[PDB]
Amino acid sequence: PTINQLVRKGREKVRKKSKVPALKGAPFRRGVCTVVRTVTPKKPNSALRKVAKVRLTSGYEVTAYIPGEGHNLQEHSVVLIRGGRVKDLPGVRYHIVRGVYDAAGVKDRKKSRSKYGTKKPK
Amino acid sequence: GRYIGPVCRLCRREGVKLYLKGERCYSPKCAMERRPYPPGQHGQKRARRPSDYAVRLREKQKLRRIYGISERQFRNLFEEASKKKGVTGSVFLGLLESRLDNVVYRLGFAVSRRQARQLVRHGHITVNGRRVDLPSYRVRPGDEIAVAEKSRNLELIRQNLEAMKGRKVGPWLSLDVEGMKGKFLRLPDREDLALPVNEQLVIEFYSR
Amino acid sequence: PKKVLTGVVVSDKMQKTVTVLVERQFPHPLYGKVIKRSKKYLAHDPEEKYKLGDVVEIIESRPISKRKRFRVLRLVESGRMDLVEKYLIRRQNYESLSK
Amino acid sequence: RKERVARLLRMHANHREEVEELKAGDLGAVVGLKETITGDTLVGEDAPRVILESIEVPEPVIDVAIEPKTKADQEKLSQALARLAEEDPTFRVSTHPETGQTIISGMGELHLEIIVDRLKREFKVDANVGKPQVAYRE
Amino acid sequence: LTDPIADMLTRIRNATRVYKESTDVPASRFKEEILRILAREGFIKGYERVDVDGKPYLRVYLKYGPRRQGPDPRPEQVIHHIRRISKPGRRVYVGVKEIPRVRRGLGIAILSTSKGVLTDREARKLGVGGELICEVW
Amino acid sequence: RNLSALKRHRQSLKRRLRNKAKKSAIKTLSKKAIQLAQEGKAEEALKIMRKAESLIDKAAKGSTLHKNAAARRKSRLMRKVRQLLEAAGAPLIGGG
Amino acid sequence: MVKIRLARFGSKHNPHYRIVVTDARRKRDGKYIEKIGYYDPRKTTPDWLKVDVERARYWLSVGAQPTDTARRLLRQAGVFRQ
RNA sequence: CCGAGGGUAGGGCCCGUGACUGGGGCGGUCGUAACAAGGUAGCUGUACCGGAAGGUGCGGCUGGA
RNA sequence: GCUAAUCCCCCAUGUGGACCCGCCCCUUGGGGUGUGUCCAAAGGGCUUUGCCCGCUUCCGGAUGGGCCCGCGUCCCAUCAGCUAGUUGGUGGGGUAAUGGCCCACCAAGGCGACGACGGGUAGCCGGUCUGAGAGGAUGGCCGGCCACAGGGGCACUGAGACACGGGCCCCACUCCUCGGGAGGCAGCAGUUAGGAAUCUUCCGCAAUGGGCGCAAGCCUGACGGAGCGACGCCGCUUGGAGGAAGAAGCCCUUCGGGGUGUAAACUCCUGAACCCGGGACGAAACCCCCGACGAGGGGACUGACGGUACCGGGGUAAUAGCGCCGGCCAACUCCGUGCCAGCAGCCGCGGUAAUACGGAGGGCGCGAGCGUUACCCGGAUUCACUGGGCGUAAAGGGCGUGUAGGCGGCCUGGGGCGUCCCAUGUGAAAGACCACGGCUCAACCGUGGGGGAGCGUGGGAUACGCUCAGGCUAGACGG
Ligand code: SF4
Ligand SMILES: [Mg+2]
Ligand SMILES: [Mg+2]
Ligand SMILES: [Mg+2]
Ligand SMILES: [Mg+2]
Ligand SMILES: [Mg+2]
Ligand SMILES: [Mg+2]
Ligand SMILES: [Mg+2]
Ligand SMILES: [Mg+2]
Ligand SMILES: [Mg+2]
Ligand SMILES: [Mg+2]
Ligand SMILES: [Mg+2]
Ligand SMILES: [Mg+2]
Ligand SMILES: [Mg+2]
Ligand SMILES: [Mg+2]
Ligand SMILES: [Mg+2]
Ligand SMILES: [Mg+2]
Ligand SMILES: [Mg+2]
Ligand SMILES: [Mg+2]
Ligand SMILES: [Mg+2]
Ligand SMILES: [Mg+2]
Ligand SMILES: [Mg+2]
Ligand SMILES: [Mg+2]
Ligand SMILES: [Mg+2]
Ligand SMILES: [Mg+2]
Ligand SMILES: [Mg+2]
Ligand SMILES: [Mg+2]
Ligand SMILES: [Mg+2]
Ligand SMILES: [Mg+2]
Ligand SMILES: [Mg+2]
Ligand SMILES: [Mg+2]
Ligand SMILES: [Mg+2]
Ligand SMILES: [Mg+2]
Ligand SMILES: [Mg+2]
Ligand SMILES: [Mg+2]
Ligand SMILES: [Mg+2]
Ligand SMILES: [Mg+2]
Ligand SMILES: [Mg+2]
Ligand SMILES: [Mg+2]
Ligand SMILES: [Mg+2]
Ligand SMILES: [Mg+2]
Ligand SMILES: [Mg+2]
Ligand SMILES: [Mg+2]
Ligand SMILES: [Mg+2]
Ligand SMILES: [Mg+2]
Ligand SMILES: [Mg+2]
Ligand SMILES: [Mg+2]
Ligand SMILES: [Mg+2]
Ligand SMILES: [Mg+2]
Ligand SMILES: [Mg+2]
Ligand SMILES: [Mg+2]
Ligand SMILES: [Mg+2]
Ligand SMILES: [Mg+2]
Ligand SMILES: [Mg+2]
Ligand SMILES: [Mg+2]
Ligand SMILES: [Mg+2]
Ligand SMILES: [Mg+2]
Ligand SMILES: [Mg+2]
Ligand SMILES: [Mg+2]
Ligand SMILES: [Mg+2]
Ligand SMILES: [Mg+2]
Ligand SMILES: [Mg+2]
Ligand SMILES: [Mg+2]
Ligand SMILES: [Mg+2]
Ligand SMILES: [Mg+2]
Ligand SMILES: [Mg+2]
Ligand SMILES: [Mg+2]
Ligand SMILES: [Mg+2]
Ligand SMILES: [Mg+2]
Ligand SMILES: [Mg+2]
Ligand SMILES: [Mg+2]
Ligand SMILES: [Mg+2]
Ligand SMILES: [Mg+2]
Ligand SMILES: [Mg+2]
Ligand SMILES: [Mg+2]
Ligand SMILES: [Mg+2]
Ligand SMILES: [Mg+2]
Ligand SMILES: [Mg+2]
Ligand SMILES: [Mg+2]
Ligand SMILES: [Mg+2]
Ligand SMILES: [Mg+2]
Ligand SMILES: [Mg+2]
Ligand SMILES: [Mg+2]
Ligand SMILES: [Mg+2]
Ligand SMILES: [Mg+2]
């Protein structure tokens, strides 16, 4: 583009699009579990991923992944969520934080216990 | 605090003898003399050609572990040398050398930096008269770094001073043995010290 | 100093007031080239001795009315209607640019 | 978690007296506490971090099903039957394994039919009540 | 034609990559002064005022390096690079402090100024600035 | 639940009275003289506009009027009276 | 009215005043008009006090008013000696 | 006189929501339109038509011979 | 209904000032001059034929403001037209003062593709974060300006307000006991609610600063300090030397062995914590005497932090955790599982021998932290000024004509607008940079130095761009 063109029109600045709108730009948001179930992931994977439907204090109602082996989350469970989508479950764009509110940490987790809210054993 | 752990495993991984014990480093009980290969289950396995990153990492931990210093304090220092004028490599090495717990060690008051550190910390070191117990004081040129004239009655200091009689010390240094005094004359030139570290590579490491 | 500007009368259709069209030039803050910006000042003509086309000078002055803060300093060139043409054509060009 | 006790209170018949101390074996109230719920343990900020015997023995012996009708105040039902499961620890909020509808478990008929209006008159929830459905087989 | 100066630099540029002995550019006292510098810095052997059908031109006699050994003997260039900075579409006007250093001194920069048509090494010593005409090396 | 600002207030109201009353007098006398100045009554006008001028300045002694406002107040008065008197002369006695 | 004042700098338990001229109603550490010296009350350096005698004289003359403990520092540096 | 605002009436913009509905994206039934001359060269603007891809008319393109 | 004054008014004096008109200088309402007119004032205190503290009018100073002008200041053109106090005039009101600020009348104008009007969003700057730089992003804490004080209107008093802790009125809410009244925490703490999340209902006026006062002094949630919180940065500790061809355990194993590992034990040395003693700097002024209440000299009172720091004597080996180990990317093996459970930032890994799941052993990385989420800049030369493209990758308008605009041949001259040069004013402080210095170091903090971009003013240069003037024929048009 000619320099004169640049003076007239100028360069369009690029705007970023929040991959996590439901957080209202918060680091985390609290919510309640309306539905807790399993959903099968897309190709080329095969499983029964544990997930939860959550109504946030932000007004949004999203579906949030439940990390680790085994959990205790049911309906009406109050739960904290964080950013990060699960690639294999479209529609899931948040993770439940283990060991906060009615969410327990993973029983008998030895490695990487902070990402699963397990306390250090004796 | 400091690394405060098993120190032989360090040398073995580095593949170079880092002198971190004093007396034993010269013994044939030195881990390096008996087992010059990396610690852990996979010590005696044919090496895999280390990546460029792999090099600069290990070349940095070398220099880092030698002085017994936190990655934080180390990094500020490096960064200080970059802001500083002229040669980043040398000046870094200089500032590293200028640390109190190091100078003390260079003048043989102790056999290890580790020991030297404790000497500074526990108080038994002074600077230009008045006591200084911080193992990080950038010693400037012109300083008298004696033993506490109130703590000279200690074998560990004595014996380590007993041996330091004739040793030719740093050109940047002078040592009044027996009277337990020591002076810091100049900051090192490049050649003045030989240590197993290609300083340029550390620079390349942080240049990533 | 009292700011002084050079411009052209493009309207004498007021009582004791003329409109002085002033051009200014400068390099573009990022793309460098010199570009023309302009502005219209309402100048005090207490004698109505200035008419369309008068290349005149106006001096920063004490307020005369709302957005009258310049008096005409002096004349520099008369009958520059060609410049009036440029300003006038464009203003008329706006009529097509509607919806 | 650490909590700031600010003032100390005693409740009388017709006034509250502010006090400076509550010795052992004595009772009163405390201002400044925010995270402490009933059944918890407080120790001096440098004291042995022990925990008293909680309590725990009676089991809810009446159970009733509640369904949010039509329909979307089951989320408005959830954060408000949460304000109460920690304060009136008696009643349980259970969802059945099979055909799972919500079963507000009370210690009694009146303990549920006075919780019935809490949800309906104070939490409003457009719902109607009845009985739990059975986990049948064939 | 819109920019004579660029054209001149270009007539030169085109001429060198085919190793022309000479090449003509239509005449202008300003093009002269620039060509004045080109010889004086040894980018060309020099120039001379000519005439083609009664039209004032300026013959520029190009300069190259020696022949070369190898698969490609085409001599090294004397003017490796020559490009306009200031343009009719966007004028470049450096002050003295901001006059660049062309290729670590190995090259020159030409600028038209209130004291004439100088180089960067030149305008610096005389302590001025002006229109950054072009850069050569 | 208390202060000495109410004291400041009680005082403010008392001052308002003195200020108002003064300004009243000024407007009353001024227009009055100007009116006589229009019919003229040349003598009685100037005769009045003096006690006007005085009271204008007397108020400016305090916080009632600012100096450069009374200055204005006095300016416009005389200009009004004189211009009026220009229709049907005989300006006697003295004031301006 | 225009004053001659100590404006605190330094830090916690490291006082370091700037003897200064500013409007009376100005914040203590706010924009002053001019600096005419400094003052280290702890006296931890050789010269813990320096007053531009010439300038303090100028302001003092025009109506600038020293604080009680401002003139002490000023007197001590002899702005009043004949 | 003006005046907070209250009221009456009629406009404008934006948000939320709505039985039903349009296609869109993501995770078995029918044919085989395109890719090899893909077994009717293909694509195309338009027009009409047909369960469906599509077919055909008129002109155009070669990114087909 | 009584009463004092530094409360209010009248008369006098008029240096002087204020106003009208005339003249003179000056040039927007600046400074003189004369005639006419108008205007001042307060007393108290002692050591008492005299000073202190106040009053009145005028002028100059100084500091703090008001108003005005140039240039700079985000997104949407799927907002393209906007405006009747609207634009100008005359007259008047108003103000400290200009102004359509307001009012009457008169004229019919004023603004807009250089983006008016409308919609969205936002307090602005010093700076801050990032970046090779250009740029981008950002305005928390500190400093400067603005705006607001439950939501709105209004004015009063005053040098100053249209006044957070002043007044009036309407609204909403709350609250005290049937007429009415009360409240305004976006002060310091604190409660409650919301939330992922943000503190003590602390100490002291000792310091500095503010208001009042002759002074003593009083007030001051400004402020100086204390408390809580790894929230951040910085410093320090959990030991130091010795100590087996190398215990036990656990892991691997070709059953020979290898690894944890000098690691531990154990030897000696040192001595965080704690214990005792001493114990601050910050504080010398205001005040008293001499001198003269001045200058100058002497002397006295005062510490919240705090019996804290720090100095000295004694003195116990005295917390370690978090992430990761397919590739990017540093760190590898056993078992368990068998497209299950699960991992995941991307490519992807799991279907019986998985360095990619889960445990273990070992290892790599940081270390009172380590990781995660969110956001900003970076890598993105992926909005390309620096510094990109457009035949087939995304991209030449279907083709002309032309408006605005951008751009433009050769020679000489005038001007000097850009451009360039020098001088000067500004560019506050803090910060940044370099230098030394103070807290034992560092963070933090002080003292000097360097100043720049921008704009104001003065002078200078004329090559290129501009403009004006005069000529040319290579562009372009015509015969
Ligand atoms: S002994 Fe040999 S191996 Fe062990 S630390 Fe000293 S040098 Fe490194
Ligand atoms: Mg798979
Ligand atoms: Mg529950
Ligand atoms: Mg360097
Ligand atoms: Mg870097
Ligand atoms: Mg007017
Ligand atoms: Mg709960
Ligand atoms: Mg009246
Ligand atoms: Mg008033
Ligand atoms: Mg007055
Ligand atoms: Mg402290
Ligand atoms: Mg109305
Ligand atoms: Mg209305
Ligand atoms: Mg009403
Ligand atoms: Mg609708
Ligand atoms: Mg639909
Ligand atoms: Mg076909
Ligand atoms: Mg087919
Ligand atoms: Mg076909
Ligand atoms: Mg076919
Ligand atoms: Mg085909
Ligand atoms: Mg067709
Ligand atoms: Mg059919
Ligand atoms: Mg058909
Ligand atoms: Mg055809
Ligand atoms: Mg009396
Ligand atoms: Mg009396
Ligand atoms: Mg009188
Ligand atoms: Mg009107
Ligand atoms: Mg007027
Ligand atoms: Mg108006
Ligand atoms: Mg007017
Ligand atoms: Mg404009
Ligand atoms: Mg808004
Ligand atoms: Mg806002
Ligand atoms: Mg601020
Ligand atoms: Mg308001
Ligand atoms: Mg409020
Ligand atoms: Mg209000
Ligand atoms: Mg107030
Ligand atoms: Mg108010
Ligand atoms: Mg206000
Ligand atoms: Mg308040
Ligand atoms: Mg209250
Ligand atoms: Mg508060
Ligand atoms: Mg605080
Ligand atoms: Mg005080
Ligand atoms: Mg005081
Ligand atoms: Mg207090
Ligand atoms: Mg504080
Ligand atoms: Mg801490
Ligand atoms: Mg730290
Ligand atoms: Mg062995
Ligand atoms: Mg073993
Ligand atoms: Mg073994
Ligand atoms: Mg050991
Ligand atoms: Mg000892
Ligand atoms: Mg001992
Ligand atoms: Mg002291
Ligand atoms: Mg005396
Ligand atoms: Mg003690
Ligand atoms: Mg000790
Ligand atoms: Mg030990
Ligand atoms: Mg990591
Ligand atoms: Mg890495
Ligand atoms: Mg690797
Ligand atoms: Mg993992
Ligand atoms: Mg397999
Ligand atoms: Mg396996
Ligand atoms: Mg594994
Ligand atoms: Mg992995
Ligand atoms: Mg980015
Ligand atoms: Mg970029
Ligand atoms: Mg870049
Ligand atoms: Mg470009
Ligand atoms: Mg294409
Ligand atoms: Mg085409
Ligand atoms: Mg044109
Ligand atoms: Mg030209
Ligand atoms: Mg032109
Ligand atoms: Mg110029
Ligand atoms: Mg500065
Ligand atoms: Mg120092
Ligand atoms: Mg400085
Ligand atoms: Mg001509």
Answer whether A32 sits within 8 Å of D74, measured CB to CB.
no
For residue A32, the Cα-to-chain-centroid distance in whole angstroms is 14
Written as one string, the DSSP assignment of G12-64 is TTB--EEEEEE-TTS-TTS--SEEEEEE-TT--SS--EEE-HHHHHHHHHHT-
Tell me the C-alpha to C-alpha distance, in Å, between residue E90 and each of A7, C32, C35, E84: 11, 7, 10, 11
The spacing between the Cα labelled CA in A57 and the C1' in I186, in angstroms, equals: 26
Contact residues, chain E, for C31 at CB < 8 Å: 90
Say what angle helices F67-85 and F42-60 make with each other, to 10 degrees.
170
> What radius of gyration do chain D's Cα atoms show?
20
CATH number of the domain residue B180 falls in: 3.10.290.10
State in Å: Cα D135 to ligand 49 middle. 69
Report how far Cα D75 is from the mean position of its chain's Cα atoms.
Answer: 18
Angle at B89 (CA atoms; ends B83, B95), nearest 5 degrees = 70
Sheet strands side by side (includes E46-52) = E24-26, E55-61, E46-52
* DSSP assignment letter at G11: B
Integer-rounded Cα radius of gyration of chain A: 20
3-state secondary structure A14-47: CCCCCCCHHHCCCCCEEEEEEEEEEECCCCCCCC
B98: left (phi over 0), alpha (psi -120 to 50) or beta: alpha
DSSP E strands: which ranges in chain A? Answer: 29-39, 49-56, 61-65, 78-83, 92-101
F71 membership: H or E segment, kind and range: helix F67-85
Nearest to D115 by CA among D87, D95, D138: D87
Beta strands in chain D (DSSP E): 8-11, 16-19, 29-30, 62-67, 92-95, 102-106, 128-129
**Edge-to-edge strands of the sheet including D102-106?**
D92-95, D102-106, D62-67, D128-129
State the Cα–Cα distance between residues E23 and E31, nearest whole angstrom. Answer: 14
Sign, CA dihedral A33-A38-A39-A45, equals positive
Q: Is B59 exposed, middle or buried (0-12, 13-18, 19+ CB in 10 A)?
A: buried
Residues 6+ away with beta carbon under 8 Å from F66: F60
List of residues 6+ apart from C11 with CB closer than 8 A: C18, C19, C52
G54 — alpha (psi -120 to 50), left (phi > 0) or beta? alpha
> Which of B129, B109, B6, B14 has its CA nearest to residue B61?
B14
Domain extent at residue B123? 97-184
**Cβ neighbourhood burial of E44 (10 Å; 0-12, 13-18, 19+):** buried
* H or E stretch covering C9: strand C4-11
- 3-class DSSP state for residue D42? coil
DSSP string of B59-117, one letter each residue: HHHHHHHHHT--HHHHHHHHHHHHHSSS-HHHHHHHHHHTBHHHHHHHTTSSSSHHHHH
Q: What is the DSSP pairing of strand A61-65 with strand D8-11?
A: unpaired
> Is B8 annotated to bind ligand?
yes
Contacts of A75 in chain D (CB under 8 A): 78, 95, 100, 102
What is the position in ligand 1's atom list of the atom closest to the CA of B24?
1
Q: Is the CB of A45 under 7 A from strand I?
A: yes
Determine the Cα angle at E99 with ends E94 and E101, to 5°: 150
End-to-end alpha carbon distance in chain F: 57
SS3 call for A97? strand
CA-based radius of gyration for chain C: 15
Return d(Cα G36, Cα E132) in angstroms, integer: 48
Angle made by CA atoms E112, E116, E121, in degrees to the nearest 5: 75
Q: How far apart are the C-alpha atoms of B159 and B147, rounded to whole Å?
A: 13
I269 C1' – E72 CA distance, angstroms? 79
Query: In terms of C-beta density within 10 A (0-12 exposed, 13-18 middle, 19 or more buried), how is residue A98 classed?
Result: buried
Helical H segments across chain E, by residue range: 4-17, 29-40, 120-125
Host H or E run for residue C85: helix C81-93
CA distances C74 to C6, C49, D89, Å, are 10, 10, 92
Chain H bases closer than 7 A to any CB of the protein: 26-27
E130-136/C68-77 β-pairing: unpaired
Residue whose token pair is 């085409």? E74
Structural domain includes residue B169: yes
Question: Separation of CA G22 and C1' I423 in angstroms?
Answer: 33
- Cβ-Cβ contacts under 8 Å between A and C: the total is 9
C1-99 CATH, one of 3.40.50.300, 2.40.30.110, 2.60.40.10, 2.40.50.140: 2.40.50.140
Span from the CA of F35 to the centroid of ligand 6 (angstroms): 28
Rounded Cα gap, residues B131 and B121, in angstroms: 10
Return the structure tokens found at E116. 């004439």
CB D71 within 8 A of CB D55: no
Smallest CA separation from ligand 1 atom 6, residue:
B25
The protein side of the strand H contact, defined by CB less than 7 Å from any of its atoms, consists of A 40, 42-43, 90
Task: Kindly indicate whether the domain formed by F1-96 is annotated with CATH number 1.20.58.110.
Answer: yes
DSSP letters for B131-189: B---TT-BPPTTEE--B-TTT---HHHHHHHHHTSS----TTEEEETTTTEEEE--PPP
Whether residues B137 and B57 fall in one domain: no
Based on the fold, state whether residues B72 and B103 are members of the same structural domain: no
E100 and E109 Cβ atoms separated by less than 8 Å: yes
Fold of E80-137: Dna Ligase; domain 1 (3.30.1490)
In this structure, what DSSP letter does residue E41 have? Answer: T
Mutation target for C interface from A7, A8, A9, A11: give the one with most C CBs within 10 A.
A7
Classify residue D134 by its DSSP letter.
P
- The experimental method behind these coordinates is X-ray
Ligand nearest to the CA of E114: 81
Alpha carbon of F60 to ligand 52 centroid (Å): 70
DSSP labels, F17-67:
HHHHHHHHHHHHHHHHHHHHHHH--HHHHHHHHHHHHHHHHHHHTTTSS-H
Q: Would you call G67 exposed, middle or buried from its count of C-beta atoms within 10 A (0-12, 13-18, 19+)?
A: middle
Cα D8 to ligand 7 centre (Å) = 27
Residues D112, D81 contacting (CB under 8 angstroms) = no
What are φ and ψ of residue A19, in 5° steps? Answer: -75, -5
CA distance D67 to D131: 10
The alpha-carbon gap from E89 to the nearest alpha carbon of chain C, in Å, equals: 7
Task: Tell whether residue B97 is among the known ligand binding residues.
Answer: no
- The answer to whether A34 contacts D79, with C-beta atoms less than 8 Å apart, is no
Pick the CATH number of G1-82 from 3.30.465.10, 3.30.1320.10, 2.60.40.10, 3.30.70.141: 3.30.1320.10
Chain E residues 60-99 within an 8 A CB cutoff of chain C: 89-93
Q: What order do you get walking across the sheet with G49-51 strand by strand? A: G49-51, G34-39, G17-22, G3-8, G65-66
Per domain, the residue ranges of chain E are 2-79, 80-137
Alpha-carbon distances, residue A76 vs A101, D77, D92, F69 (angstroms) = 12, 8, 12, 75
Buried b or exposed e, range F48-81, using 16+ CB within 10 angstroms: bbbebbebbbbbbeeebbeeeebeebbeebbebb
How far apart (Å, rounded) are the C-alpha atoms in residues A28 and A30?
Answer: 7
- How many angstroms separate the CA atoms of D71 and F8, rounded? 64
Is B128 a member of any domain? Answer: yes
Q: Which of E24, E30, E17 is nearest to E61 (CA)?
A: E24
**Resolution of the model in angstroms:** 3.0
Tell whether residue B29 is among the known ligand binding residues: no
- Distance separating alpha carbons of residues C20 and C69, to the nearest angstrom: 12
A94 CA distance to ligand 74 middle (Å): 33
Pocket of ligand 1 (CB under 6 A): B 7-8, 11, 17-21, 24-25, 30-32
Q: Residue F16 corresponds to which tokens in the numbers above?
A: 């308002």
When divided into structural domains, chain B yields a total of 2
Structure tokens at C86: 């440029």
d(CA E67, CA D10): 109
Residue with minimal CA–C1' distance to I40 is F61
Which tokens hold the place of B25? Answer: 């480093």
Q: Which of B111, B80, B92, B116 is nearest to B193 (CA)?
A: B92
CB G19 within 8 A of CB G48: no
Say what the alpha-carbon torsion angle B96, B100, B101, B107 is, to the nearest 10 degrees: 100
Which 44-73 positions of F have CB less than 7 A from strand I?
50, 53-58, 61-64, 66-72
Cis peptide before D71 (omega within 30 of 0): yes
Burial of A65 (0-12, 13-18, 19+ CB in 10 A): buried
CATH classification of the domain holding B71: 1.10.1050.10
Rounded to an integer, what distance in angstroms lies between the CA atom of residue A22 and that of residue B55? Answer: 45
Selected residues 2-31 of chain A with any CB under 8 Å from a CB in chain E: 2-4
Q: Does domain E2-79 have CATH number 3.30.1370.30?
A: yes
Tell me the three-class secondary structure of E82-114, residue by residue.
EEECCCCCCCCEECHHHCCCHHHHCCEEEEEEC
Of D74, D81, D100, the CB nearest to A34: D74
For residues E3-42, one letter each, b for 16 or more C-beta atoms within 10 angstroms of the residue's C-beta and e for the rest, the string is eebbebbebbbebbeeeeeebbbebeeebebbbebbeeee
Query: Integer distance in angstroms from CA G4 to C1' I17?
Result: 35
Ligand 1 atom closest to residue B18's alpha carbon, by position in its atom list: 8
Whole-number Å distance between alpha carbons of C42 and B106:
82
3-state secondary structure of C7: strand
The CATH topology of domain A1-122 is OB fold (Dihydrolipoamide Acetyltransferase, E2P) (2.40.50)
What is the Cα–Cα distance from B108 to B175, expressed in whole angstroms? 9
What is chain E's length?
137
**Structure token pair of residue E83:** 């490009």
Taking phi over 0 as left and psi of -120 to 50 as alpha, with beta for the rest, F90 belongs to left
